[PDB]
Amino acid sequence: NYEVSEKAFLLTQSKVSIEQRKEAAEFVLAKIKEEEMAPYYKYLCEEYLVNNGQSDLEHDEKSDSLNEWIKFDQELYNELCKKNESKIKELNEKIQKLEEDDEGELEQAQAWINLGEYYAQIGDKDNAEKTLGKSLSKAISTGAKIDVMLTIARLGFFYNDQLYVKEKLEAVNSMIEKGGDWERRNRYKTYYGIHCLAVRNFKEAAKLLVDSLATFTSIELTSYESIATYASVTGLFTLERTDLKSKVIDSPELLSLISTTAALQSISSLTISLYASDYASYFPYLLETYANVLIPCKYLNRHADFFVREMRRKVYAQLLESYKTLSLKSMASAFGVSVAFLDNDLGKFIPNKQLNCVIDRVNGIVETNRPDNKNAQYHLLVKQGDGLLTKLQKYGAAVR
């Protein structure tokens, strides 16, 4: 389920390197017409029309792939249908006999679990959900919850939905029992990381995602590689350098991981960079990481220059605190950045309250002031008090 979703995302989000799109299109093509999934193939074809890299052939010319088939097609309706006939016919006879006899209360649930397979696979949302939800109402084993939990997940990646996926994720988790159980937790942990990186609080994501108790794969709820790279990468962006040397290069899981891959440039190169405190090293590496890991990813593409801007701020910041009367002519020349870049993105940082850098841009000199002061707390305390205040006027708008 995940490798299909992942390569459809990869496929559309391509504009560089031939073998990426080519190999993507082949796997999508092979799987999606074996599987009864028409509506995502459609979406794929909608989303990847009038793009570069086309593997669609209906009118195009913009193709750079060596596969000339990922268009929505009529062959689809012979492969899908003979399978759909077989599956509907088997399952119809099966549900009828099991439910008549009334043997057990656990054969009944196995009979409704078969329609949640069927239905997520064709891509119905609401039918899949309420067919399975029966099992939970006829809760008599915790199994019923495991089918509820698995189904929200499959559908989730396909659509790329945060909100009803969050809602259902919370409702099924919290429910009757709760438990430390392994793959309810693995699934809860990645998905919480997804959403909160999406809101842009970012710290909340970090609290669960960076931490992992899964040293091996969860297949279709995520690939081992995939979660692991994502945890290290959020690690870097949103946590301190005191945190980094604690936990994000000194957890024993990361150690078995850095063994064989260091192309993640964030389990190696950027972590080392951050520790060493450089900014002659850092910025080159970040761009290389952005291309190689963020833009292939389904989750970290959407956070673009924010991800860039805050990391360049964090590195400037750890330098700004360590020194005082600081020679901007010297920095701007030789810590690996251009002069023009350094001023204007430093100045871009300063009003937002992201640096207490005391600049003179062209006289070549920078000094430093403390990053917290009474004023800074007063300003943000005031921010939150009027946040609070507005919502009560809203309560007293509809009620009253």
């Binding site: 761009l287 220059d305 030789a334 950045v337 251009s338 002069v339």
Partner: peptide, 19 residues
């Protein structure tokens, strides 16, 4: 944007060879 980071990359690379 996607474009900016590149423009900036190229500017940096040009400085760097003369650094």
């Amino acid at each position: 944007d996607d474009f900016t980071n590149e423009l900036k990359a190229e500017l940096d690379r040009y400085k760097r060879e003369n650094q």
